[PDB]
Amino acid sequence: PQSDLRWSKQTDVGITHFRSGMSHEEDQLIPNLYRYIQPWESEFIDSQRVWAEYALKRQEAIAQNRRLTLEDLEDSWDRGIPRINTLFQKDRHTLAYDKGWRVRTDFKQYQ
């Protein structure tokens, strides 16, 4: 409600009352979580054209003799098809020798 956004301050002159911006229309606290998630169409479409830059950069890094620059990856750090954070994670070489996490997680319900 627009009648629950009033705050007062008594600092120098007196108790000055003010109101939050609600004169346009009714208030809407959470419009939708769906509009903040980058849904599957946008996610898959963007992340499809993400690794291609990583392979043009990995190819560029191997041709130019450059290392994995986190600054160059900051533009392709968003999500990846899988997490890009796992690509440059701390256990990258210690977690890569384990295949089948989805099946192990699925039957965890029965464990």
Binding site: P1, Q2, E25, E26
Partner: peptide
């Protein structure tokens, strides 16, 4: 009644666990 009561999802007469009545004058 300050709200529009049209942007709401389907309808909201009274959310007070007492909606015995059912009418809007649609017919």
């Amino acid at each position: 009644d300050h709200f529009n009561k049209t942007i709401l999802p389907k309808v909201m007469q009274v959310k007070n666990f007492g909606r015995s009545g059912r009418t809007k004058y649609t017919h």
